[PDB]
Amino acid sequence: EVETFAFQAEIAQLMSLIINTFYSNKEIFLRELISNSSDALDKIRYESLTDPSKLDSGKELHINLIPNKQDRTLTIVDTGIGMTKADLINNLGTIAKSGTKAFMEALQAGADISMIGQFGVGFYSAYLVAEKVTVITKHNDDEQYAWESSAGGSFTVRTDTGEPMGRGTKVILHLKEDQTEYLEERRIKEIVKKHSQFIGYPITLFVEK
């Protein structure tokens, strides 16, 4: 059973701007997704400080980066707090309507696209490099769900029958044909060192056969 939803007009506009604006510094998508993972990990850590059972779904707090050249996917996995179905529908747990308004007001006052994360909508920078994004998520208070969008104004949500995750979020980037540099180990390492060198959780870059 698949449910199809329309993005709010402002979010559709944000996505079309990210997809259609000429902007060469696309590598920031990875910084933004790693930052979102760090924020999700901080949230489950904080909840566990007063309720240790919150980590019964998994004690390890980490971020994995998994390139797959056969599938042309880069996957960012974290064991953070995850998202409920309601969170997914509500713009992946963001205040994206007001964040988009603040971002676009900053742009017309001289900011650039790389500042997107300051407005709480950094997730959508995935569309700098991905033609389709799949988000698999499990929150302690809900079942495992898959969100997906190829932009174009709509997204889908379905219960996920795939591999159980325990707790956290997996962002699967189905990369555009001309963005395969982001599957190369040396390129990913360079971006992580440039922008994420201080993230307070272990980041493991998986290698391929």
Ligand SMILES: Nc1cccc(Oc2ccccn2)c1
């Ligand atoms: N998400 C996150 C949080 C804290 C530090 C960090 O790493 C950084 C930050 C700036 C420059 C180099 N490394 C990343």
